[PDB]
Structures are given as C-alpha cells and as structure tokens.
Amino acid sequence: GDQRFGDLVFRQLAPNVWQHTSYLDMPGFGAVASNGLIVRDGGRVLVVDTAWTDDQTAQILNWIKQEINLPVALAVVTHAHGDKMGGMDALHAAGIATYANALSNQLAPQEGMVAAQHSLTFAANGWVEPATAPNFGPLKVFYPGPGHTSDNITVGIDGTDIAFGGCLIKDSKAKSLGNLGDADTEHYAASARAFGAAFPKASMIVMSHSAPDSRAAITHTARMADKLR
Ligand SMILES: [O-]
Ligand SMILES: [Zn+2]
Ligand SMILES: [Zn+2]
C-alpha cells in the first residue's frame, strides 16, 4: 500500500489523512523511522510533525505539492526533539505558520531545534487554550502531562477514528518505551492514560515509531510506563 517518494514513505490512513515517514541511520538503532501526519481540510493542508531533517521535510512538502497541490496552512509539532522539529527551517522557508506547545518553544534552543513561530497554551484540563490555536480545522490538540518529554502534546483528528500520540505512545507489541533521555518517569504512565481518556472514540492510534495500532497501544505503553516508577 505504501507510496515511496524519494527516501520517505507516505500511507493513506483515512479519507483526507496520510502518515509521513522519514528515516535516520543511527548505529545502535538501525535506520529509525519517525511518523507524522498530513491532513487535507477542504482547500488547505495541515501538517503534524516535521521529519528528522530540513531536506526530508522539504520532501514532505514536495509530496504534498504533487499529491494534493493545496497550500499548507499550518504545521503543529509535538515536542522539541529532532524527529518532530528537525525540519522547522524547511517549513519556515516555505512560508508555513508553525505552532508548538509554549514549553516546546522554550526548550527548543537547548534541544538544538528552531522554535515554532507561535506558541500553544493549555487549559487546566489539558485542552489547548482556543486563542492560541487559530485555524486548526479538525486538529484537536491535547496536553496529556509530562511523559516521553515534559512538553509532549497529542492530536486528535475530528471526523475520523484517529488520534496521534507522537512519541508518548508505543505499539501494543513494543518491548520498551524507546528514547527515555528526557522522560518524566514518575508521570509517564498517567500521561499515557490521559491521552487515551481525551480521545475515547479513537480506534486508530498513530504514533511516531510504530505503525498505527489499536487502543491496546495505549494500555501497553502505560503498563511499560508503570515499571519506570
Ligand atoms: O523523539
Ligand atoms: Zn522525543
Ligand atoms: Zn521520537
């Protein structure tokens, strides 16, 4: 099913929703896939997450030009690590307005990333403060608490069965929680469960480093996270 386009892979998940996948060759971990999303909302496109690098992110935009040929109205990036924010300059060179958690933008420089141009803030229940998320279309942005990182956010796609956990969530057969270098080991389990609770009807869980899975990804991730505390 998957479309190969240069060194990236694109898979349609639902009407109007595609998964983008990019790779980085890192001894110790093989060629590491990272996934994000592309959403068509009528006459515009929305992107969730960059690729690892600026060049790869430019290739995402080239795939969008070829396959959709509509403007990319905005991108939201789900925390300040390179698999999610490595390509910010490519977005900015393309004139795309970029959004991230306020805390991601503050952490971006120390993580070697370029901040998004706009900051999202969150209400006490975890839902994005509306004034900070203009024109988000079907993207429903939720801060579940600290986990994979302090700043990690998640995104549901209204009108679909899809919720994106980014690097917070691992698939139901995952043998570890992957990169824990910036993790909050105390709060991870709860944050994973809060993601699930925010998007109860989402039966397709999309994530950064596994193929899409059932909601067993959420329960399994949270059980792996229980053991870090
Ligand atoms: O990451
Ligand atoms: Zn990360
Ligand atoms: Zn990651």
Strand partners of residue 35: 21
Task: Decide: 83 in ligand 1 pocket, CB within 6 A.
Answer: yes
Host H or E run for residue 222: helix 216-226
Q: Which residues contact 124 (CB under 8 A, 6 or more apart)?
A: none
CATH classification for the domain delimited by 1-229, as one of 3.40.50.1860, 1.10.10.10, 1.20.1070.10, 3.60.15.10: 3.60.15.10
CA dist 21 and 173 (Å) reads 20
Name the residue at shortest CA distance from atom 1 of ligand 1.
81
This structure's resolution (angstroms)? 1.2
List the 97-101 sheet strands across, edge first.
3-5, 8-14, 17-25, 31-41, 44-48, 72-77, 97-101, 118-120
3-state secondary structure of 68: coil
Cα(42) to centroid of ligand 2, in Å?
A: 31
CA dist 157 and 199 (Å) reads 10
Distance of CA 29 to the CA centre of its chain: 20
DSSP string, 139-172: EEEE---SSSSTT--EEEETTSSEEE-TTS---T
Tokens 């105390």, residue? 186
For the chain, which residues make up each domain, given as ranges? 1-229
Residue 150: nearest ligand to its CA? 2
Distance of CA 3 to the CA centre of its chain: 20
CA atoms within 13 A on the CB side of 83: 24
